[PDB]
Amino acid sequence: GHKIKGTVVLMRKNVLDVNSVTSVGGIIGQGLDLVGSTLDTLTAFLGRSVSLQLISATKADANGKGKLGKATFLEGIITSLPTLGAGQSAFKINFEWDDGSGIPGAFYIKNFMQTEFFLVSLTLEDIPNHGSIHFVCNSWIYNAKLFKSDRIFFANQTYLPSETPAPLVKYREEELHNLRGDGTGERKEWERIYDYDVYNDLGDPDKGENHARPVLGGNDTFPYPRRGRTGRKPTRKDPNSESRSNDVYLPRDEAFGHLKSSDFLTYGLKSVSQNVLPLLQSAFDLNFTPREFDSFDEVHGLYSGGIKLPTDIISKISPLPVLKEIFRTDGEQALKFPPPKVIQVSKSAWMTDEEFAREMLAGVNPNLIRCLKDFPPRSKLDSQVYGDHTSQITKEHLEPNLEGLTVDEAIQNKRLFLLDHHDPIMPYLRRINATSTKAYATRTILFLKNDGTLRPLAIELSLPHPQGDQSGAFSQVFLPADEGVESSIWLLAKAYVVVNDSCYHQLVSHWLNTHAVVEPFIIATNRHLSVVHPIYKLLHPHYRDTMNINGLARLSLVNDGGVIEQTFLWGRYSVEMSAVVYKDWVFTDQALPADLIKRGMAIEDPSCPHGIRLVIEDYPYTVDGLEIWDAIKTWVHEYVFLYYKSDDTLREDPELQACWKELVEVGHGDKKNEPWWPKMQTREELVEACAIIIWTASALHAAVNFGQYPYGGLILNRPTLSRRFMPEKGSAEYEELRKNPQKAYLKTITPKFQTLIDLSVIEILSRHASDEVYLGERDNPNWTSDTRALEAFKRFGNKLAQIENKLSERNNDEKLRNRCGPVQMPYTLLLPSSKEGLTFRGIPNSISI
């Protein structure tokens, strides 16, 4: 018949593996672009090492399964190739194919090498009038005897759940079945089995009672999204907890390798909590560095001279992989930190009222503020009088040197806003304040001034059960002052609000509303939508490395004695408190327009550009994100209506339906009966659902994760812990504010040790890897043969490229100063593209850090 020409592109384990790639990190992509040939070790793949077998998409055998044509082995290396690129090795392989064998549509691969490799692609240079077929793989191929079923890959062509090619139908449903792989057994590194399980692996019951943590999800007290199932043996002292392991399983392929050493961020983070944390505390349990800061100047010295420690420790936390890049130093005993953008221009601006309020709109947590409708603000808590009652905010003390409006008119004109942190911490406060932490539940009323700037009017510091629990809310309301002890008091007052905000942001805005919430969709997508499905291809890029970064969090971030419990206010009740907040989480309210309206920050107004009128126009996060959200909406809508002819073609889609059902009923199973879930019946419901998922994985996480060090790298500006209560007016504490307010501020906020852990961790989190795939229409190569989709994708990147310039001119507009503030820090967090490193910009396609 003939002999089809195929070219296989792969990558060897050495190239992507951290343990062996800890040599290159200064520059990647270059180095003669490993054409494969030079330093030939590739002969190893030749011979009886790897075999491929074509599956016909047009010719079906006895039953109806496509005809397979002779296992062919790799023959020879292709030295160069126009589009080879770094770390890749090409191989030639011709297949025995007759004219009457049909068109290939999938292939099987066997790896007899005893050392996995990353298969990249396969291209076929056909026979009849049919063009070149491309197979995009990007998957690790492990030894052939470990599988029992044999790895299968499908060509470029995207087909609806019809599973289209008849000879290909049973191959499509079979692999999907392989992806679910039942729900029994312990998962191994080489497996690609996606399944759910509850959060029952965060504590360590065997090591103690002090170490057990409540089971998150599967119950009504602490509901939570499901997480990827790992099959470890249960804890001994507890059948419902999973035993800890220094290695958490995630389906192979969800774990992304890198070419550069400095890009294994999860590796850096694991090392900080395993090598750096333990080594760091010994120097404090010693005396090389005092346990506390004594002045602000001593804090500013962290990014200048750094912190001197015994060279014995430095020669240990310096030569190690990935950190050898992150950590700054001079030589012997001097761990420095890069200066955060917050003080690069002015070192004092963070203390200004205008900066404190501006950060509620353009900061690390710009998602909470809400337009105040009634007065005084009331709680949403139960019958414990203060929720039934309200807030004790002084209506007698609102609006000093500003507007001569009443509280009734200010609300009518929509000039009053609220940053409510009262309810979430309240029920755990008596418990939190029993430890070494002393916190308050807070509230802060802000006023919109004529110049467009926001200004905090009053802060209410509330405590629990003043002689009770019922009819309880020991509140105190503090007002702004610019001098005398009253100003040192006010400064401390803001630190109480911020300690609440930083913790709410870390656990909710960030971990919960992003990392936690997105994982069940990833499991749902892989278990039910075939790689070939159009929706699968729309979703995939936004899932990259999410399960891997989350697996690390469960292991050392949000675990029993992790960094989060040790650095944030909510302490050991950190994660469980976020499950209590999950209670109020509603999918549809995650869309930017809905969220804004929900918080009263925007009203529906058809005349306006995005269909909504903003209550505060100088609102960076909102103004910018609305542009990106709309870009996402248009792209998903164009993409969806390209494959779905009518609403009935959607309802007929078995893969899409089984996917959503399992997502609602299992993935976010604690909310299966929620009335707000979209029904996958209309095409506009699928557009909305997909837009929310993408928004969450890209722009929401970006706006939330990337300003962490730039704003919070200065612990004074974003303290994460409160150690003291507000100084008693006549006590020796009050006299200390008068004497040394700086040291008074330092004893109230996060201690020195925890500050070094926080800076280390949020420094890694806020950095962009060099091989980051950005929202800016970035994908990888030929993900689909559908020319129409490719074009709709280019249009997407094009509107993003235009949005970028658009955001750039706003930062140069001096009338919009909530974008810069006294700190002179232009809001660049929502710009799509970035270079690498601590760049206060860049929107990755997915939650990768």
Catalytic residue, candidates 510, 533, 540, 637: 510
By the rule CB under 6 A, 518 interacts with ligand 4HM: no
Closer CB to Fe ion, residue 705 or residue 742? 705
Cis peptide upstream of residue 376 (ω within 30 degrees of 0):
yes
Is 540 annotated to bind ligand?
no
Question: According to the binding rule CB under 5 A, does residue 705 interact with Fe ion?
Answer: yes
CB of 16 to ligand 4HM, least distance (A): 22
- Candidates 95, 303, 496, 511; binder of ligand 4HM (CB under 6 A) is 511
Question: Would you count residue 553 as binding ligand 4HM (CB under 6 A)?
Answer: yes
Residue 118, strand partner residues: 11, 140
Is 510 assigned a ligand-binding role in the annotation? yes
Cβ 201 vs Cβ 244: under 8 Å:
yes
Q: Is 557 in the site for ligand 4HM (CB under 6 A)?
A: yes
Among 200, 705, 828, 846, binds ligand 4HM (CB under 6 A): 705
CA distance 781 to 319: 36
> Is 421 labeled as ligand-binding?
no
CA–CA distance, 51 with 35 (Å, rounded to integer):
22
Task: Dig out the tokens for 272 from the structure.
Answer: 């900080």
| Partner in contact with 553, chosen from Fe ion, ligand 4HM, none, beta carbon below 5 to 8 Å by kind | ligand 4HM
Catalytic residue among 701, 717, 762, 803: 701
Query: Stretches 289-297, 465-473, 549-557, 665-673: which one binds ligand 4HM (CB under 6 A)?
Result: 549-557
Rounded-to-10 torsion of CA 645, 647, 649, 651:
160
Subset of 75-94 contacting ligand 4HM (CB under 6 A): none
The phi and psi torsions of 456 (rounded to 5 degrees) equal -65, 125
The token pair at 171 is 């191959």
Distance (Å, whole) CA 477 – CA 106: 69
- 540 carries an active-site annotation: no
Selected catalytic residue, list 258, 421, 422, 515: 515
Nearest distance from C-beta of residue 704 to Fe ion, angstroms:
8
Nearest approach in angstroms of CB 515 to Fe ion is 6
740 is catalytic: no
Q: How far is the CB of 203 from ligand 4HM (least distance, A)?
A: 14
Binding site partner of 594, from ligand 4HM, Fe ion, none, Cβ cut-off 5-8 A by kind: none
Interacting partner of 513 out of Fe ion, ligand 4HM, none (Cβ under 5 to 8 A depending on kind): none
**Contact set for ligand 4HM, span 765-784 (CB under 6 A):** 765
In whole angstroms, the minimum distance from the beta carbon of 553 to ligand 4HM comes to 5
- Indicate if 300 belongs to the active site: no
Least separation in angstroms between residue 505's CB and ligand 4HM is: 10
Question: Is 637 annotated as belonging to a binding site?
Answer: no
3-state secondary structure of 478: strand
Burial class (CB in 10 A: 0-12, 13-18, 19+), 632: buried
In this structure, which long-range contacts are made by residues 482-487, counting pairs with CB atoms below 8 Å and at least 24 apart in sequence?
485/734, 485/737, 485/738
Distance of alpha carbon 151 from the chain centroid: 30
Our measurement of the distance from residue 34's CA atom to the centroid of its chain's CA atoms, rounded to an integer in Å, reads 32
Minimum Å gap between C-beta 510 and Fe ion is 6
* 849: contact with ligand 4HM by CB under 6 A: yes
610 vs 606: CA distance, rounded Å? 8
Q: Which is nearer to Fe ion, 135 or 199 (CB)?
A: 199
What number of other Cβ atoms are within 10 A of residue 796's Cβ?
Answer: 20
Residue in the block written with tokens 């306006």: 608
Q: How many residues does the chain have?
A: 849
Catalytic residue status for 510: yes
Rule CB under 6 A: say whether 506 interacts with ligand 4HM: yes
Q: Is 416 in the site for ligand 4HM (CB under 6 A)?
A: no
Picked from ligand 4HM, Fe ion, none, the partner binding residue 726 (CB below 5 to 8 A depending on kind) is none
In contact, 72 and 93? CB cutoff 8 Å: yes
219 is catalytic: no
* HEC secondary structure over 408-440: HHHHHCCCEEEEEECCCCHHHHHHHCCCCCCCC
696 binds, among ligand 4HM, Fe ion, none (CB under 5 to 8 A by kind): none
Q: What is the DSSP letter of 248?
A: -
Which residue ranges make up the site for Fe ion (CB under 5 A)? 705
Catalytic residues: 510, 515, 701, 705, 849
